Design a binder for this molecule. Structure first.
Ligand SMILES: NC(=O)N1Cc2ccc(Cl)cc2[C@H](C(=O)Nc2cncc3ccccc23)C1
Ligand SMILES: NC(=O)N1Cc2ccc(Cl)cc2[C@H](C(=O)Nc2cncc3ccccc23)C1
Ligand SMILES: [Cl-]
Lengths: 299, 302
């Protein structure tokens, strides 16, 4: 029993964190094989080709623990700088670079000076920001998932928006969201609630013995989506309904039956009650996160 | 900016997780140097659990009865001893991944990271607090016994918890790494219930200071309180008494935000009276009590 916001064990990622210093700027890098990936704003109206062409290999100081790595090459791929180093990371795990969709969750290994300080779980918001916890020096910290023994890198931290939320890229340097890596006026779009995730979390509450919110009612996908649109909830697709199938079979509560529970919660509130120790509807657990935590999958 | 429930990077602990098998029971062990620490109930059957005589059960065991597995490698047990409710299995190989470590016993209200494991394999990491009733509100399934709680301040891992059991309310009970249970619990299938839980007051105050550091002041008021008046009010909401030690501990946060501890106590009293009125504090509609004053300083400042 119990339901926690749980991150993947960060060990395979910790063994990849390095410190990248260039000029006055110091941030984090991800050392995989003989390449260190880091935000290109470490070289810093920025013409990044012009700024990068003025740098030599020895301008980038890469530090892996108490060992200085020597940079033998450098190239840019979108908003990510790839520093070729002489040494292949012996701690390089089996990995992939994956781009995630909004609503998908991942673990963040927050780092400062190439040293991991914390690990937390978070979701790619529908507005492409992440509600993370980062201070200055956190740039280059990575987001990942673990599938079997393979680490899928999905996020690299680049910046903080004026509302305190965060923006970054996939490991190929493509930003999530309409953001750019420069000091210009940028704001996160109006956020919405990840509906399939709230439903997954209601199923987790049912699995954990909390059923007060259940009701005899059902609804249609169209009628539920008319309610979802009114409460700034993401539309629930047939794919989401299919994805919630296993949880629906396990608890005996059809996805449209759980949708009517969610509809009543949105219109009437919780009425002094909590669900899994929360007075708000939690949307940062995917259906797979719920199944994984309520089954004990290991890595 | 931002405030998350953050766990310590689990890497130093992952490299210590092993699987311990005794008969039909399989649980997790912590391999540090040449010793594997695990709950002593690994030697029990389901029947033995009502009134186990651990000394009697352990005396009938030999080293080769304990199967220890570190990854895809079987370790050889060369000795065994019991220290309180933990079994210490001397093995023939020192763990090369043994980090700098300490065994620390924590007090209620203290937080720590839990590396939940099944079959000696880590599956997840989460942050939690030792409740005032000595239980932890964890996320544990059958086979998670032996999973550990820790903090990693600097490069040293301080092991503070080993999971032993789930109580009937879904909460968890365990021991420090010397085998001493937190709380009035026993490693027996007997009628045991967690005492009435209370809110960790000093932690809620620390979290209100984190909200101030992050720019949220909506809950502040023009009032102050005496420590005694705060405790009389707080007790009525099932909040732990706030001691002078807690007030002293909140000193740095008070100096940083410019809000006196007893002035922050007055905001808390008002929040308990009024609720949040549709608002949130650090993305939460409830008063969060699983961040200590030390956690707030670490995360908000560095
Ligand atoms: N003004 C300022 O501090 N920045 C400007 C800027 C402009 C563009 C880009 Cl791509 C990055 C940055 C950096 C950034 O956002 N870094 C930071 C990242 N995360 C959390 C922070 C908390 C506090 C301060 C910086 C954080 C630095
Ligand atoms: N009923 C049952 O299976 N147990 C009884 C028991 C009695 C005393 C002692 Cl010291 C340990 C145990 C074990 C224990 O609590 N393990 C478990 C630990 N954590 C979460 C669990 C979730 C679900 C089932 C067991 C969990 C095993
Ligand atoms: Cl303590």
């Amino acid at each position: 029993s119990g339901f926690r916001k749980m991150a993947f064990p960060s060990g395979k990622v910790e063994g990849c964190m390095v410190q990248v210093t260039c000029g006055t700027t110091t941030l984090n890098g991800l050392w995989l094989d003989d390449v260190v990936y880091c935000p290109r704003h470490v070289i810093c109206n920025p013409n990044y080709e012009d700024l990068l062409i003025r740098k030599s290999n020895h301008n980038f100081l890469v530090q892996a623990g108490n060992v200085q790595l020597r940079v033998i090459g450098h190239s840019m791929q979108n908003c990510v700088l790839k520093l070729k180093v002489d040494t292949a990371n012996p701690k390089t795990p089996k990995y992939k670079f994956v781009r995630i969709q909004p609503g998908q969750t991942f673990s963040v290994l927050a780092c400062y000076n190439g040293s991991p300080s914390g690990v937390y779980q978070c979701a790619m918001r529908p507005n492409f920001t992440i509600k993370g916890s980062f201070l200055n020096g956190s740039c280059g910290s990575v987001g990942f998932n673990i599938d079997y023994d393979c680490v899928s890198f999905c996020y690299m931290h680049h910046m903080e928006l004026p509302t305190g939320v965060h923006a970054g890229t996939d490991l190929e340097g493509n930003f999530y969201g309409p953001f750019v890596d420069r000091q210009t006026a940028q704001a996160a779009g109006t956020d919405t609630t990840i509906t399939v995730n709230v439903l997954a979390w209601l199923y987790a509450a049912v699995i954990n013995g909390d059923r007060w919110f259940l009701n005899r009612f059902t609804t249609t996908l169209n009628d539920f989506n008319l309610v979802a649109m009114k409460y700034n909830y993401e539309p629930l697709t047939q794919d989401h309904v299919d994805i919630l199938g296993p949880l629906s079979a396990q608890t005996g509560i059809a996805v449209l039956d759980m949708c009517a529970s969610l509809k009543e919660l949105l219109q009437n509130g919780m009425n002094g009650r909590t669900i899994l120790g929360s007075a708000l509807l939690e949307d940062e657990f995917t259906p797979f996160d719920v199944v994984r935590q309520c089954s004990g999958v290991t890595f």
